[PDB]
Amino acid sequence: GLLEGKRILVTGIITDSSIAFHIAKVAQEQGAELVLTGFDRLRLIERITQRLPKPAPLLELDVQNEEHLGSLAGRISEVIGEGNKLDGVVHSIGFMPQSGMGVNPFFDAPFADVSKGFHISAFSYSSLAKAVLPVMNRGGSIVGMDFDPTRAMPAYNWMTVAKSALESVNRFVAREAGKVGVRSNLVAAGPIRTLAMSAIVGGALGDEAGQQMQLLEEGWDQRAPIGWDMKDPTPVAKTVCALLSDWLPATTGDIIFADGGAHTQLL
Amino acid sequence: GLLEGKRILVTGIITDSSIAFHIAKVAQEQGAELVLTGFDRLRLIERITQRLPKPAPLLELDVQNEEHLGSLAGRISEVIGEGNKLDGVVHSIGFMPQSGMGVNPFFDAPFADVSKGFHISAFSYSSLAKAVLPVMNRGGSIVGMDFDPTRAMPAYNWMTVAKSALESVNRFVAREAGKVGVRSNLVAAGPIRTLAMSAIVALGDEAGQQMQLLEEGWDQRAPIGWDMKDPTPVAKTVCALLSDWLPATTGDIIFADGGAHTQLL
Amino acid sequence: AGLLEGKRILVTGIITDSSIAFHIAKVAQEQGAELVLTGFDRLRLIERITQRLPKPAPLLELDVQNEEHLGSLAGRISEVIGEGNKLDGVVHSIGFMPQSGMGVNPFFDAPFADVSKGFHISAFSYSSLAKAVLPVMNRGGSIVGMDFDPTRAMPAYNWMTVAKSALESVNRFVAREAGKVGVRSNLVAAGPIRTLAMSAIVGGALGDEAGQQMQLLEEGWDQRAPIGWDMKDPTPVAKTVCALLSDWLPATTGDIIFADGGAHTQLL
Amino acid sequence: GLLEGKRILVTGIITDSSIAFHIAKVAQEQGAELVLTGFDRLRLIERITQRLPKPAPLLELDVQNEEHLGSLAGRISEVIGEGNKLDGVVHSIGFMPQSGMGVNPFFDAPFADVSKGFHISAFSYSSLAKAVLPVMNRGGSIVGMDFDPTRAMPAYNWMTVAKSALESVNRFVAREAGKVGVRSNLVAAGPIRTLAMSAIVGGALGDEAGQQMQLLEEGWDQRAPIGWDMKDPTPVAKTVCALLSDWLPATTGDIIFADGGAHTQLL
Ligand SMILES: NC(=O)c1ccc[n+]([C@@H]2O[C@H](COP(=O)([O-])OP(=O)(O)OC[C@H]3O[C@@H](n4cnc5c(N)ncnc54)[C@H](O)[C@@H]3O)[C@@H](O)[C@H]2O)c1
Ligand SMILES: NC(=O)c1ccc[n+]([C@@H]2O[C@H](COP(=O)([O-])OP(=O)(O)OC[C@H]3O[C@@H](n4cnc5c(N)ncnc54)[C@H](O)[C@@H]3O)[C@@H](O)[C@H]2O)c1
Ligand SMILES: NC(=O)c1ccc[n+]([C@@H]2O[C@H](COP(=O)([O-])OP(=O)(O)OC[C@H]3O[C@@H](n4cnc5c(N)ncnc54)[C@H](O)[C@@H]3O)[C@@H](O)[C@H]2O)c1
Ligand SMILES: NC(=O)c1ccc[n+]([C@@H]2O[C@H](COP(=O)([O-])OP(=O)(O)OC[C@H]3O[C@@H](n4cnc5c(N)ncnc54)[C@H](O)[C@@H]3O)[C@@H](O)[C@H]2O)c1
Ligand code: NA
Ligand code: NA
Ligand code: NA
Ligand code: NA
Q1: Cα A48 to Cα A38, A63, A89, B115, C251, distances in angstroms
Q2: Where does this protein hold NAD(+) (chain C) (predicted)?
């Protein structure tokens, strides 16, 4: 297996459409031993994670909760064994209140909403790394999920701003993680049908949300030289597992695109 | 003059070393009529702005204060005249608590501090645009100050993250401002000796060595050199973007850094 | 009162009154600059075009593939501008890629000799022109070239896009050399400006599928641009070039300034 | 193995320091069956390829030679078997005449020299793809070697221009290759001590250029959060093998950095 014998923490499962669910699934198929975290809906997440190929312990983690973060490393050590450390950590956590996305006016998002979105979507990448690095092996790998924010675009609005901040945070986490021999990278994915993608069509009434998703998928698949399927998270999941493996050992502070090549083409 | 007859709002003057002070100075030399804003120490700012070439009214604006923002357009109209609008707006506002910069470890910056820095340095570019666009002419220009955050740097830490956010905010502000014929752009300046940039740093030998190497390297990398004690080239570049001479540039970043960012060594 | 008052500026690249260089020259003269112009090959026709400019200007022959033309250019410039005078600005507005490299053949089928010629004219010659003119440029001068954003692949533009990527790299090295004598070097990345060659593709020169793609590509600029984009109006591009020729961007070099309506900053 | 059962063409071996030699070594260790090509010094390359873990046929290929390119597919088919195709192709080919490098003035490099370097280092990435795509399986992978040309550098001079052109070529190759389900990507490596740059490193293209190359290497390891070892091509070879594998299946037209993270850091 690609990740045989590696112990990996996977955040961000909420439904079995979640990108983290497919990251966790491929990682287990490739021999990894997982620890999972879940936010808020722990009973529902526990049932969801039973659909994964192999059993894995589930820990509660709200990245806005400094008590959760401060106890996380010790809670991880309790489940993986006294003398054991993590080899990989997956950040697959994002949120932006409704006012910050969809057809809602960009100028009308109140700061309290945008700040919450920045906290969960960008600041928390530093928060999670700070919490887990003490229980990470040298040679380890932290990977976060990104959506290319180089250019502005409709509907993504303030979540785009949060991703721009996340990219910057990743470069600084790589400085800290490198002091202990750990890599830090983002995977910039093309669009995937998840709960997150439903936030993007927020405000659309009627068949508008469906047709907006149709236009998004059509244009992405068109630009991508090898095509793009928003219903298939497996290629993104594999890319994350590639970064969690030992096969990109000189890549850190970086962004690896898993978008079908769409961002390299203009029409 | 380059800005003859243009009415321009300039935020961010705190001393005569402020970048906004030199922007305001050059803009007046080039025929512009200015309105200034000031945060917190208004009595001191009023006296400092008397050093500018020409008089300009001063309005209070704390960009975290929604009442200040919501009244700003009406307060601008009171000073420039009933039937008049602004042609330009300069955002030269930046702040990050000490926990988010310097020798303070990146991981130890509390969220409340970083959020305040994000508010003042990135979110407020949108807030300011929202407030002034109703009293801006078509063909107008909004310019903000940037420091290239494409790569991580020691000591700048969370201020670099805020600048990464600011670049993204500018691209979305350009979409809103473009609806009314207004451009929005950032000037990415090389390092300048100001109060805000001195906050980034006295604080031990590691911080001292980091900044010397940053400054040493910037003049070295820049093909035409870089003078950290001279804000004039940055001020002129902002005036270039306020003028009518870059009329098809918006949502963009213009570098006034000696060309340093184009060179590796 | 002119943006370029008293400045002596060399403008290459005029072939018709649609040439971007023609509009650069027009605005620069309107802003008080004194121009020297260059033209390639059929100078008698180019001279009739340059008579349409607001003010008279000498025209010098320059084939940028001809090293004798390049080696004699500085002296020929000095002869027309006066013994003790130098240039303040230079505009490179020169580009060409043979048809095989811009869609008439598939990308893989363009012969190297054609592509090499396009690279020579469109990228290498920015270095060649800088070498030739820098001896007669004042400190504080400015060299500006024309770019078409090559960050992403596009239909039909093919090897010309490769040439522009090369030109962007050349500009960064010219900035190193020019900076030694106090001269800035920059590119203006313009949005598309209507031409006969690309109009032919939109007319169905490369078939109906390629025609639709080129038109969609062009239309997309005005759509993406937050302030719109007018493919028939080179004046905003001309003004931006004059802005880089002025003294108002004095700390910008090795760089790329976009005059594209903001299109490249937007994804839809 | 990461490349088990895959047939891969590797260009660019000249000595056992070549990046291509280490790509070949790791690929064979990971189960790949290789075909190798060599330019000009075929007796030397034959001996060099005997140092690899496993035997591999060696084919002559001068990428400036259109006859070599036009016969290449058939010569590949002859050695891999009638009904078999390639799964991967590695372009590890670069050259710029001395006039285009070192202390030799950038403005003085004659066009004939720069055009030759452009042909070998950038155009031939398209030429090789054109030549090999007819004998490539769907789902295959083409990988070329890049040196980040986003910013100008001492001594690399016109080779940096060639790399900027190569990055553009890669995006158009990805378009064409994507039509038949093949990916095309570059690996931007940190500096590695190889034959091509040895004279510049040794001061033979000026004492100043030698000094600047040392400063470049020192700063590269300094910037890199996980360090950079200019004598160790293994992390680069592994990254190329990662792109040849099935684990980055949604990445094309792209550039993957194997540089210690140096390019993401300013000091
Ligand atoms: N779906 C796409 O098109 C897309 C594209 C690129 C990147 N991404 C990114 O991938 C990541 C995963 O999103 P997804 O598409 O799988 O959607 P998702 O809704 O399934 O996952 C988002 C996760 O964030 C968690 N989360 C929210 N607030 C949290 C908090 N306070 N503490 C801890 N966890 C919290 C949620 O519980 C959920 O598990 C996000 O960063 C998203 O922005 C998504
Ligand atoms: N100094 C540099 O090296 C450098 C480089 C590039 C860009 N910049 C940017 O230029 C801008 C101006 O900074 P400077 O270097 O002139 O420093 P400065 O300290 O002189 O100016 C910063 C200004 O921000 C104002 N400000 C802070 N909090 C505010 C609030 N709540 N509401 C309104 N205004 C508030 C201050 O009153 C001050 O006038 C900032 O955006 C800074 O990030 C600075
Ligand atoms: N038209 C657009 O959409 C567009 C967009 C962006 C950039 N540009 C660039 O702007 C520049 C000007 O192009 P244009 O649109 O005005 O087209 P154009 O055909 O009018 O100008 C190209 C010029 O190059 C000259 N030239 C060609 N070979 C030469 C040689 N051997 N020696 C000297 N001069 C030579 C031609 O005589 C002509 O004057 C080019 O670099 C072009 O790539 C054009
Ligand atoms: N060494 C580094 O620091 C570095 C960094 C990044 C990328 N790269 C790139 O990696 C690739 C491999 O170079 P290297 O450093 O391993 O050096 P090398 O000297 O070991 O390999 C260069 C190869 O190019 C081949 N080549 C030259 N002309 C050719 C032609 N006409 N036809 C076919 N092959 C030809 C040579 O035979 C040789 O095998 C090059 O593209 C180089 O630019 C190298
Ligand atoms: Na496609
Ligand atoms: Na310098
Ligand atoms: Na538009
Ligand atoms: Na280091």
Answers
A1: 11, 20, 20, 34, 57
A2: 13, 19-20, 63-64, 94-95, 164, 193-197
C-alpha triplet D51, D52, D58: angle, nearest 5°: 100
Resolution expressed in Å: 1.9
> What count of residues does chain B have?
265
What is the separation, in whole angstroms, between the first and last Cα of chain B? 38
Q: Of A60, A56, A61, A62, give the one whose Cα is nearest residue A27.
A: A56
User: Which tokens is C101 given?
Assistant: 């490299």
Structure tokens belonging to residue A60 = 């509660």
φ, ψ for residue C194, nearest 5 deg: -65, 135
Token pair of C245 as six digits: 């020729």
Q: Where are the alpha helices (DSSP H) in D93-149?
A: 111-118, 124-132
Contacts of D152 in chain C (CB under 8 A): 169, 172-173, 175-176, 254
Find out whether A93 is annotated in a ligand binding site: yes
Domain count, chain A: 1
Write out the DSSP string of D210-223. HHHHHHHHHHHHHH
Q: Which atom of ligand 4 is nearest to the CA of D17?
A: 20
* Chain C residues with CB-CB distance to D167 below 8 A: 165
Helix (H) or strand (E) holding B37: strand B33-38
For residue A64, how many other CB atoms are within 10 A of its CB? 15
Chain A touched by B39 (CB under 8 Å): no
Q: Are D98 and D108 in contact (CB under 8 A)?
A: no
C11 bridge partner residues: C37, C91
Method: X-ray
Three-class secondary structure of residue B34 per DSSP: strand
How far apart CA C149 and CA B217 sit, in angstroms, is: 29
Backbone angles phi, psi at B36, to 5 degrees: -110, 150
* Contact (Cβ atoms closer than 8 angstroms) between residue D240 and residue D187: yes
Query: Is residue B20 helix, strand or coil?
Result: helix
D99 SS3 class: helix
The two three-digit tokens of residue A75, written as one number: 């809670």
- The domain of A94 spans 1-267
